[PDB]
Subunit: 266 residues, 2 copies
């Protein structure tokens, strides 16, 4: 059967803005929170209005007094020398570096972020940071503050939206995804020096002109995060519940980020 037929079959009644709003409150999402969100649309079961419903639901709970952030990574703009998903012929690499269109926050699609993110990032009043590989989008009270001045180097480091979320004592919401999607733990890797440094590259508009721009980042390794997540959960203070069929987690970003930092040093 098609993906969609299975999704419908595993749903007893439709998910709606209203039932999603209800499930989010039940889990503990509150007006005025700062929350970074990671999601799988399909994991919820069938939704009337798909991604738009999920976005509107989150907004209705958090409100404009709170802030929603999602990662909007665009790794298709990276140096093809290092591509594996899929690799392309070596003879294409320079053509790509010379022709791939420059990052533009209002235009460039995301890769591997999900339909909720694609909806969110083009939604009215949502704002996006200027990083060409590792940007975030945000909506609400601290949206501009969170996304402004993202350093080109160390995209998940002390000068990124993650650090701004940390200073706001924000929350992480995982909807139907595990710890390997939990971007905030990249901040633990930065602070522990857990992973090696790499020269990266991306196309940007600089002084009006298109430049292939190089910089330093960390070779972030998500495979760790599942391990870290299981140990973090034993310590307590991860709230768990369902949004439709989606296994969801809600936690404080400071808590997991501080635990992650110790996990890598010990």
């Amino acid at each position: 059967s098609n993906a969609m037929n299975d999704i419908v079959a595993s749903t007893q009644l439709p998910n709606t803005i209203k039932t999603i709003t209800n499930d989010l409150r039940k889990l503990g999402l509150k007006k005025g929170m700062t929350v970074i969100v990671h999601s799988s649309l399909s994991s919820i079961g069938w939704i009337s209005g798909g991604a738009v419903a999920v976005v509107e639901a989150l907004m209705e709970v958090i409100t404009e007094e709170g802030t929603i952030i999602m990662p909007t990574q665009s790794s298709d703009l990276s140096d093809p020398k290092h591509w594996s998903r899929p690799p392309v012929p070596e003879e294409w690499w320079q053509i790509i570096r010379d022709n791939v269109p420059a990052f533009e926050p209002h235009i460039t699609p995301t890769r591997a972020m999900g339909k909720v993110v694609e909806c969110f990032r083009t939604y009215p009043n949502v704002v996006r940071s200027n990083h060409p590989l590792g940007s975030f989008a945000a909506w609400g009270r601290h949206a501009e503050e969170i996304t402004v001045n993202q350093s080109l180097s160390m995209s998940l480091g002390e000068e990124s939206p993650l650090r701004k979320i940390y200073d706001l004592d924000g929350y992480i919401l995982l909807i139907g995804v595990g710890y390997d999607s939990n971007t905030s733990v990249g901040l633990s890797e930065v602070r522990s020096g857990a992973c090696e440094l790499i020269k990266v590259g991306a196309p940007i508009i600089e002084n009006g002109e298109r430049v292939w721009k190089e910089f330093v980042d960390m070779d972030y390794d998500s495979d760790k995060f599942v391990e870290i997540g299981v140990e973090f959960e034993q310590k307590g203070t991860v709230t768990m519940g369902k949004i439709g069929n989606a296994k969801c987690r809600l936690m404080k970003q400071r808590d997991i980020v501080d635990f992650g930092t110790e996990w890598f040093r010990k």
Copy 2:
């Protein structure tokens, strides 16, 4: 297939804005022309920049002095009574009608229009017509003239963007797609007077408020569009050429609409 490794192996060298631009000019696309575009991204072969490269290429060739149109249909808003892809239990139908978010031109995503349209839809200075099921988006000189005052009933009829393209002696561009994707033939169906009406439903904003609205339209049938296409290419004028691996067709909209109108009449 649609697997990325297969799309890379289908391609000798990458497609770029520059190569796509050149292919479009070779086919007959010109500065200042009015053109409605239908596309498959995968059909072209691997593109550096994907959908962004295709939109930039089109805009480069046509320029602000021309007009680009694309269908931005949103059939996930239709009455679930008739869904087949997939169908949903009858018990969900009234809940769907009570809960599916209303059409909002800056928010409502498209369904089955393709990645090129989803990219295009969100560009700056792109304007979208007002129809919850059969909207269009446009950019350039005639973008407002074409998209304004679309009627709710007979969505592809005499008060639709299709008739405005017809009046402007515009062109239809198919990229790696067939005549079942040729929306303009709907205007033929309306005009023939030969086809049968149906009651349809969708959620709109009326009085600044969400309502499920019912209206009349044609039971547009794209299998007759395909029959019309085969005959038209035997009889009428159509330019064929390639964009990467994509077989493409460029034709005058007035020519196929007039032919189809006769075809439906017999």
